[PDB]
Amino acid sequence: SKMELPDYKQWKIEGTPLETVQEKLAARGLRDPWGRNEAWRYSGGFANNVSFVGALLKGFKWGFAAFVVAVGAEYYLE
Amino acid sequence: GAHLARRYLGDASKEPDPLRMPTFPPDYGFPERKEREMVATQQEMNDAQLMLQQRDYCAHYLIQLLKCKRDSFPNFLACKHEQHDWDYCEHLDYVKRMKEFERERRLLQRKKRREQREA
Amino acid sequence: FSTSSQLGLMMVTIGINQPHLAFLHICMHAFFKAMLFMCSGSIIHSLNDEQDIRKMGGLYKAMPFTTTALIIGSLALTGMPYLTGFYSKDLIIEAVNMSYTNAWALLMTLIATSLTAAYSTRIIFFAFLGKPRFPPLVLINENNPLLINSIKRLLIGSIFAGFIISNNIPPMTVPNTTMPLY
Amino acid sequence: AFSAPAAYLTHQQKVLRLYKRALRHLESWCVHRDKYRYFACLMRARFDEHKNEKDMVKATQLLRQAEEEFWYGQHPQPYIFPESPGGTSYERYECYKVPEWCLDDWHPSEKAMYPDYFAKREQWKRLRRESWEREVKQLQEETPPGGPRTEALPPARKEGDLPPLWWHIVTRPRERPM
Amino acid sequence: KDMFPGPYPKTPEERAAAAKKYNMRVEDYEPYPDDGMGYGDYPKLPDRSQQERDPWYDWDHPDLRLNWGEPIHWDLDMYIRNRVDTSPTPVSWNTMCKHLFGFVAFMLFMFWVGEIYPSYQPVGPKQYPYNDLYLERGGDPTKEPEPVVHYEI
Amino acid sequence: GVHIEPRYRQFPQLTRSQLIQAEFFSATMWFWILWRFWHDSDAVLGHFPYPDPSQWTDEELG
Amino acid sequence: PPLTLEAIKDRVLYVLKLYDKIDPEKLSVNSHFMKDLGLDSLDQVEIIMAMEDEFGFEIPDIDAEKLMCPQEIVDYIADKKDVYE
Amino acid sequence: SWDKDVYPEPPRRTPAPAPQTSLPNPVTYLTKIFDLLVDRPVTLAREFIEQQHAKNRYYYYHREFRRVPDITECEEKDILCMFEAEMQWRRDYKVDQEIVNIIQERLKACQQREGESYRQNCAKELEQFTQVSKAFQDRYSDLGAHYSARKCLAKQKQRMLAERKAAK
Amino acid sequence: MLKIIIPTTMLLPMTWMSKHNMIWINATVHSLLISLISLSLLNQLGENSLNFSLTFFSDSLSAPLLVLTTWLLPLMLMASQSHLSKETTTRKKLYITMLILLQLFLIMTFTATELILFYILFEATLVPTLIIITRWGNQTERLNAGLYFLFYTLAGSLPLLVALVYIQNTTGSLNFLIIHYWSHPLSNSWSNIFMWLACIMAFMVKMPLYGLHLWLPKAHVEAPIAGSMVLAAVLLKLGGYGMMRITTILNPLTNYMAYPFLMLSMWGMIMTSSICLRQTDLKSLIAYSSVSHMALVIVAIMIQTPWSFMGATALMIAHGLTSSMLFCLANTNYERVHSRTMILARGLQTLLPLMATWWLMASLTNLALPPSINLIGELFIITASFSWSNITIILMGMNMMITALYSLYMLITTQRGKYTHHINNIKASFTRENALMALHILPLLLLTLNPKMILGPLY
Amino acid sequence: GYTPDEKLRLQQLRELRRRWLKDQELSPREPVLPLQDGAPWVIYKTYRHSIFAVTHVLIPVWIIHYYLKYHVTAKPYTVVERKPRIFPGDTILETGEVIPLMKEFPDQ
Amino acid sequence: SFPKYKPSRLATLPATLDPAEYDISPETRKAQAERLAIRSRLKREYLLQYNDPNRLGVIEDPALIRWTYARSANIYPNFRPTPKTSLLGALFGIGPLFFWYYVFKTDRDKKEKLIQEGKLDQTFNISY
């Protein structure tokens, strides 16, 4: 069950805000050499995260559906 | 908070003083005023162990609410009507106090108008 | 610091001469604040004893259950209606406004409520939202029955205890029935 | 494991330490990784700008002004690694660390609970007891006549000789004793 | 035993002997001013809290950040890591005092102003029956209270 | 016993129970909020009134 | 988290391979940054910071400056974390 | 077995149960379970122990001290009479302390029992303790650590001389 | 009272004629039995004292002190066994005989009916204490400490002797009963002022009073463990008992004369606790703590109110037990490391956990954690002072805060932190030492259940 | 970085430290002292649960109830209960009843 | 030109902002070398005693003994009655005593005056 590290080549600055930072640096003539090391943070499942409003409205869809069902029950029964 | 604005930023004499209220006598204006009748009796209150702050002109509705709450247990959702009744009585008492405040405001303004009439 | 601010709110409630409301706020604060601290402890243990929010990020999906618990706790703390906080804090503020009060005290209480919302936003935004900033080795694992059940009980409490207790307890204060909409 | 300190910090070493502190405080300010990378490359460029100053007085004055800038711009609550000094977990397990000599005071029943380990410990005790005299002799020989002018200690010169003053460093308690 | 601290040094030979006794450099060694306080020979070590000393360095006493044989500060117990700390602050001490004291003063001043101008509601006083609960509030039944009358609005 | 293998630089393994329970409790919170709001609205219990008429309280006018 | 010696070596080499200035092909356990590689002093500081961030433990500057080799970093981390295998 | 006159208790008025909902009352079933599980075994155990005690009933008696001449009638340096009077005064001091304790116990019980109406419905006990406290303070307070019957007599005489001066 | 006195006397021939092996064992058995016999005295009639004979009487004040002494002797023997092992048999027997003579003198002091006999034996207690300090102390300062102790006590006592003889000539008797029953008030005259000073100053020296307390730190630091135990537990309380007994004669002038001593004690408790904050020697810290508690007791006595006296008795007993245990705990570490410097030994909780628990409980009692009898006495004294003046609460509360600070500071420095690396002589705590700490603690916690035993006659 | 002598010393100490750590490992056997109370399979699921329930609540509740019976009788005023809120309604013994006569206005 | 950091007694000046750390001379380096030599000699002696397999007991540090003696014993022999010593002793010794005497005496006199005037409430003050 020994842990296996992922292939180092898979990490890339492309498609990440790190590429935008590198573009700004190249515009000012500088190059950042550590982008690939920080690439993993912006890549994979970590890439997509909800907004604060999205975080608050977690389960609101199912909650609203349950609310509609229960209100239908309450109104229908009487 | 607007009444506070009138009290502080504006002329203080026109606006009523909450501590001093009511300065003018009840007989002034209002040709006939009935005594605020108390529906509940003093013994009833003492027996029901109502809090002194709750021993007001609406203590009867609270007495009924307490009785319904004790009788309804375990069900705690069965006193909504009695709760509404007591709440409305408290609302009306608040409205009456607001009317007292407005009466004091107008009476102070009329006094200021008399003082203006002198000049 | 959130606990200290809530204690100050309770002391204010005592000052407004509304003791039973302060006791109610104590009762609700126990639930939601203990739950928030348990969520913090779970985050710390998952991230190998890391407590700085700057080194914590993107945990919304990494730790779903702790995230739900902390969101609910923050909403209760900030006075989201019909949660535990609503039955206590909303009544606290409403009584403070509708009473003979030091002006600066009332203003500071309102500002403090704003700041409570602010720091709830801070913890949620820096910790659960965004991209991961923790060290490479990912050891996140909340799948422990003790942790899950312990947080579950306080979650259910934060959601429903406010309503249950408020309905059951005898009325001890004359309610502020009518007040301006604002 | 710490190396013996030097009498003074060379100018290069001081510049390195200032660079490390500045990067760490910038990381504390720049919470997000991308912004940190941008401003860190900026700082690296700033160091490279005067990297090759020939006048040592000018470089020293630049160091002084940069240190003043660091003190003004230091993060009020800089990030501290959890086990680092000032960190949350610094010295947390210190009470759990127990010196090895506590073992010799065990009751014979407890020592019989783990015989084999104590045989190994007796072997280590024999080794230390044998090596002490040679270690002292080596320290005398290599020591300058005036006296040890640095905390550095010599390695083992010959086979069969243990490093001088090795016992406590080797037998220091485990970081996580439990 | 010369190791024990002696009187205040007055000759350079005395100063050198004291410096060697306290295992300090002669030029670094500086005895407390002989004003009769009783310090005598003991050196005036810098008032640096043990927090300031570098943690990373291997100290003979790690918890105290002190090495053996080093001269011990007269008020070391005061400047232990668990007690009074003099480590440099990000903000100037005077500025910190200014900000804190000003904040507290303004706070109290504004509270006093709020006392001058207390917030309230545009309502009249709450009216209570039975002469504002005269009896219920502990009023003497034997004595006759003023008959408080509340009329309807 | 390795229920969740620590992953070096990828999204951590999540068991389904975590997701299901978290979603259930968040949905319960939102359902409770909506249900209470629909059944009982704390907005107002009688609009804040103003007694404009002077004759209502006092109308001496001299 | 046993954190064996081989794991430490793999992670150190991983960080170094992710370093753009170092070319991955010639990177070796004994590849001195100063001599075998083209890294300067500031690059040594940066790689030390990267290592300490990867492993989450801070390397003191007096020890940090004297690494100068990936194998030295690996064994230093092993000494700090009490890795004996 | 405490005397009701010594420890008054207002008559108990307990409202009758008047349920208005169909839901079963948990308190009732829990109290019945508590009765069956606890109260009955405890009552049985006390029945057994009371039977055993009744098997061997023996009586203890409350001592009676005849009144003795007070320090007022005791002669000077008359150590025997002074001793008897001083011990009698000490016993009276203890009895007065106990009386104050009884009144305070009534006060506390009345505060708790009345509930939110304590301020009004306990006024009589408050007045009783007021009188008892004033008397006790006048009789015994400020005598000091080395209180003696002679010092109490001296306090009484000082008070009476002040009263005559007030009478002018 | 001879039921206690005569066996205590017989302890001496038994110790002298016992075999060299069995001296400690026999002494401990019979001293514990004597304490069990002394336990009977606790039963005190409320109205009147137990007047056993003309010479001896006991009240609710003397009985707790006698029980404390009889309990303290075996504890002193257990503590002093360790460091006297190397001594020759004759020297060990001499030490034990000094302890037994001290216990005998203390018992006779607390039970004596005549003030002159009380003075004779109360001054007689100096000789065994002085011999103990100056012969079995372990530092060169023991001679100076013994001189200071002896001369302070004698300078206080000799005017007391003159005053007692003058009282015998004037009133005609020094028996405490007769004095209490007749007790004619004093007049505010310079002669009576100086009689008041003469009567009070000997006990004010014995109870370490600020400005007269210099002997106590030297004596307690320089004395052996057993001598420190008696000095802290009973010898200081000798002053409290004397002051409480003697206050009957000086009834009115006390109001005028208390203010100097009252202020001295009230400020001195704060000063001595602040000294405790910065002490570098553990024994010295405990000594200054004792000074502060005794200053509280002095305030209680001078106030002369019933609650003050009850608190004074409770504090006397509780402080005696706490200080004796604290000295024993410090002595254990001193035996292990052979230094009294607080900083030298650190992190002993990891090395010796049960001793750390003993230290915790001892400090908690020292800082008056409720419902300890320490807090009962201190709280009663505080309430009495508040009735005396509401402004006393400021000083009393400040003293309480500083006591908590220094107690927990001693606990933290000695028993917490990293262990001192170089010290290797720490060994598992012996059953004797843990037994001694338990014998100190368990009675103290038990007395909380039935506090009327140590609340004094005025209860 | 280090001087060659420094490198050699560090390597030596490293080897010795790793040797010490590996010597800190125990053997396959942890010797223990050699049936005090018989316990075959004793249903820890429910039987031990019931035993805990009894010993921790039932025994204390019985003891406390007995102490309540003693203490209540031993001294007057030991147990004082708040006078039950007698809302206008039937009483058990007094059977008193009263109505405020809704002397008010119902509309809301 | 960022605002400068004013060092104080409880906020020492950082070594980084030390005006002397950037003004180094050969003699300063010599002094640093000498101090390092002293520390190295002391550390060598301590470690020699500390790693000795034969040693059993404390390593008596002369510095600690000196510190204790200077804090306790050496004070009085090296004390001289001087105007500062005398004035500070007088103040911090007797002044507080007289201050508390004044405060408490005034309070007690006020209370006694009220009691004599019968203008003090002790309605239930029956436990003194």
From Swiss-Prot, chain C:
Superkingdom as given in the UniProt entry: Eukaryota
Localization per record: Mitochondrion inner membrane
Membrane-traversing stretches: 1-18, 21-41, 63-83, 104-126, 154-174
Role description: Core subunit of the mitochondrial membrane respiratory chain NADH dehydrogenase (Complex I) which catalyzes electron transfer from NADH through the respiratory chain, using ubiquinone as an electron acceptor. Essential for the catalytic activity and assembly of complex I.
Assembly: Core subunit of respiratory chain NADH dehydrogenase (Complex I) which is composed of 45 different subunits.
Family assignment from sequence similarity: Belongs to the complex I subunit 5 family.
Protein name: NADH-ubiquinone oxidoreductase chain 5
Swiss-Prot record, chain I:
Transmembrane segments: 22-42, 60-80, 98-118, 147-167, 193-213, 224-244, 257-277, 284-303, 308-330, 351-371, 391-413, 435-455
PANTHER family: NADH-UBIQUINONE OXIDOREDUCTASE CHAIN 4 (PTHR43507:SF20)
Membrane topology: Multi-pass membrane protein
GO MF term list: NADH dehydrogenase (ubiquinone) activity; ubiquinone binding
Function per UniProt: Core subunit of the mitochondrial membrane respiratory chain NADH dehydrogenase (Complex I) which catalyzes electron transfer from NADH through the respiratory chain, using ubiquinone as an electron acceptor. Essential for the catalytic activity and assembly of complex I.
Catalytic activity: a ubiquinone + NADH + 5 H(+)(in) = a ubiquinol + NAD(+) + 4 H(+)(out)
Subcellular location, record wording: Mitochondrion inner membrane
Originating organism: Sus scrofa
A Pfam family reported for this protein in Swiss-Prot or TrEMBL: Proton_antipo_M
Gene this chain is encoded by: MT-ND4
Record keywords: Electron transport, Membrane, Mitochondrion, Mitochondrion inner membrane, NAD, Respiratory chain, Translocase, Transmembrane, Transmembrane helix, Transport, Ubiquinone
A Gene Ontology cellular-component term: mitochondrial inner membrane
EC code: 7.1.1.2
Subunit structure: Core subunit of respiratory chain NADH dehydrogenase (Complex I) which is composed of 45 different subunits.
Protein name: NADH-ubiquinone oxidoreductase chain 4
Main location: mitochondrion
Top EC class, one word: translocase
Sequence similarity: Belongs to the complex I subunit 4 family.
A Gene Ontology biological process term: mitochondrial electron transport, NADH to ubiquinone
